[PDB]
């Protein structure tokens, strides 16, 4: 009943950021949402004293036909202040990530029944617009704690604390982390329990007076780690041999002790590229000696929370995308590669899109944060289609790679 009182960043106004063009099945979507919004009290028209602004569009989430509302309060949330609660910063769960299976909640709507600080208020800015400008754009902003803000979760968390007791307390070995408007609830049991158990805990929640039908369900224990390997032939040819030191090269970036010297040996002489050449054995041992090296872990890799994450994607054709999240340059935190297809089949950014929130969800249950991702795209492809094929209630931050990765291949 009663606001936290809540400002920026010392120094730091509020965001002002403009309204990118809005499709109008999705402006249509939004007046609708937003009208009943309203009229539950969640949001509040405003007048032109109001400078501020932040970008909105809609959305559909897993498996769903309905409109969702989605706010990009990335400016926002970097521009006010790093919210520390009676907390003082909670550790993130590292059984989370060695769980059987991890189901994703969406606790979302529980935030819209504690009411915003008022001076706060006028920073969570946003504008409906109009196609072709041919009317005023709408004006809304938040009277209670919105959606995709980082001082949402802060400020619930004491409620959630409270709301999850009786539950945590009955079930002391499920593990539960909360991320933004997601809930992630792991544990060791079967998936039918799991259900049982996800379904007694929704009901638990919506008993607290909290779409929360709906989960996502991931399984760490059989997520994706990729050791370097290097081919196993009867016959080499010189471009065989060429490519092998090649990646031996790039992997001495990263493990200390490669050895290309014997392997560079036959590559001495001008032979033809198709042409086998016969092993010798210094080559051999050499090659072995190698595999040895590459099969234990990387030397001095660890997580630094002060740090950001960072994440690479290649393009490796066929539906294959791989994967790298790490801090430091040759230094791996983790790495992957999809196969996926849902519905991508053709499309390209579909593709990248969903690789992007999958990545973005992993290294949430992993580090309980999200990675800054360098994308094997054009500005103004990812900038125009990015938000078509979006369903998570979260963003993460990306910057573009336009120069083609030697690298690329040696991943694949
Ligand atoms: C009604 C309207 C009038 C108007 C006058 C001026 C000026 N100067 C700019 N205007 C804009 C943007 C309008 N808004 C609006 N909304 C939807 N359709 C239209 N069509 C339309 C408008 C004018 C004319 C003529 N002549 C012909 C067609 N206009």
């Given at each position: 009943?009663?606001?936290?009182?809540?400002?920026?960043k010392?120094?730091?106004?509020?965001?002002?950021?403009?309204?990118?063009?809005?499709?109008?099945?999705?402006?249509?979507?939004?007046?609708e949402?937003?009208?009943?919004?309203?009229?539950?009290?969640?949001?509040?028209?405003?007048?032109?004293?109001?400078?501020?602004?932040?970008?909105?569009?809609?959305?559909?989430?897993?498996?769903?036909?309905?409109w969702?509302?989605?706010?990009?309060?990335?400016?926002?949330n970097?521009?006010?202040?790093?919210?520390?609660?009676?907390?003082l910063?909670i550790?993130?769960?590292?059984?989370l990530?060695?769980?059987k299976?991890?189901?994703?909640?969406?606790?979302?709507?529980?935030?819209?029944?504690?009411?915003?600080?008022?001076?706060?208020?006028?920073?969570?800015?946003?504008?409906?617009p109009?196609?072709?400008?041919?009317?005023?754009?709408?004006?809304?902003?938040?009277?209670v704690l919105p959606?995709?803000?980082?001082?949402?979760?802060?400020?619930?968390?004491?409620?959630?604390?409270?709301?999850?007791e009786?539950?945590?307390?009955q079930?002391?070995?499920?593990?539960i982390?909360?991320?933004?408007?997601?809930?992630?609830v792991?544990?060791?049991?079967?998936?039918?329990?799991?259900?049982?158990?996800?379904?007694?805990?929704?009901?638990?929640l919506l008993?607290?007076?909290?779409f929360?039908?709906?989960?996502?369900?991931?399984?760490?224990?059989?997520?994706?780690?990729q050791?370097?390997?290097?081919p196993?032939?009867?016959?080499?040819?010189?471009?065989?041999?060429?490519?092998?030191?090649?990646k031996?090269?790039?992997?001495s970036?990263?493990?200390?002790?490669?050895?290309?010297?014997?392997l560079?040996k036959?590559l001495?002489?001008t032979?033809?590229?198709?042409?086998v050449i016969?092993?010798?054995?210094?080559?051999?041992?050499?090659?072995?000696?190698?595999?040895?090296?590459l099969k234990?872990?990387?030397?001095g890799?660890?997580?630094?929370?002060?740090?950001?994450?960072?994440?690479?994607?290649?393009?490796?054709?066929?539906?294959?995308?791989?994967?790298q999240?790490?801090?430091?340059?040759?230094?791996?935190?983790?790495?992957?590669?999809?196969?996926?297809?849902?519905?991508?089949?053709?499309?390209?950014?579909?593709?990248?899109?969903?690789?992007?929130?999958?990545?973005?969800?992993?290294?949430?249950?992993?580090?309980?944060?999200?990675?800054?991702?360098?994308?094997?795209?054009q500005?103004?492809?990812?900038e125009?289609?990015?938000?078509?094929?979006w369903?998570?209630?979260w963003?993460?931050?990306?910057?573009?790679?336009?120069?083609?990765?030697?690298v690329?291949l040696?991943?694949?």
């Amino acid at each position: 009943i009663e606001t936290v009182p809540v400002k920026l960043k010392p120094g730091m106004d509020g965001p002002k950021v403009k309204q990118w063009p809005l499709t109008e099945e999705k402006i249509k979507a939004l007046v609708e949402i937003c009208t009943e919004m309203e009229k539950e009290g969640k949001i509040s028209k405003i007048g032109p004293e109001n400078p501020y602004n932040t970008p909105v569009f809609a959305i559909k989430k897993k498996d769903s036909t309905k409109w969702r509302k989605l706010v990009d309060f990335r400016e926002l949330n970097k521009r006010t202040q790093d919210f520390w609660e009676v907390q003082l910063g909670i550790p993130h769960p590292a059984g989370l990530k060695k769980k059987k299976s991890v189901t994703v909640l969406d606790v979302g709507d529980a935030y819209f029944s504690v009411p915003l600080d008022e001076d706060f208020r006028k920073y969570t800015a946003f504008t409906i617009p109009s196609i072709n400008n041919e009317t005023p754009g709408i004006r809304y902003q938040y009277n209670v704690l919105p959606q995709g803000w980082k001082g949402s979760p802060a400020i619930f968390q004491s409620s959630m604390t409270k709301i999850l007791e009786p539950f945590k307390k009955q079930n002391p070995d499920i593990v539960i982390y909360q991320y933004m408007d997601d809930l992630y609830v792991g544990s060791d049991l079967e998936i039918g329990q799991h259900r049982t158990k996800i379904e007694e805990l929704r009901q638990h929640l919506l008993r607290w007076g909290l779409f929360l039908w709906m989960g996502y369900e991931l399984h760490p224990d059989k997520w994706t780690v990729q050791p370097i390997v290097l081919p196993e032939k009867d016959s080499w040819t010189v471009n065989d041999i060429q490519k092998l030191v090649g990646k031996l090269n790039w992997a001495s970036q990263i493990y200390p002790g490669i050895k290309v010297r014997q392997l560079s040996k036959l590559l001495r002489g001008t032979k033809a590229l198709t042409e086998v050449i016969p092993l010798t054995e210094e080559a051999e041992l050499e090659l072995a000696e190698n595999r040895e090296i590459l099969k234990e872990p990387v030397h001095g890799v660890y997580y630094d929370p002060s740090k950001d994450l960072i994440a690479e994607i290649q393009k490796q054709g066929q539906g294959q995308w791989t994967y790298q999240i790490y801090q430091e340059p040759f230094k791996n935190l983790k790495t992957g590669k999809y196969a996926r297809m849902r519905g991508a089949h053709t499309n390209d950014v579909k593709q990248l899109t969903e690789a992007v929130q999958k990545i973005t969800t992993e290294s949430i249950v992993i580090w309980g944060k999200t990675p800054k991702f360098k994308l094997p795209i054009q500005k103004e492809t990812w900038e125009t289609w990015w938000t078509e094929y979006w369903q998570a209630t979260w963003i993460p931050e990306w910057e573009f790679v336009n120069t083609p990765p030697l690298v690329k291949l040696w991943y694949q």
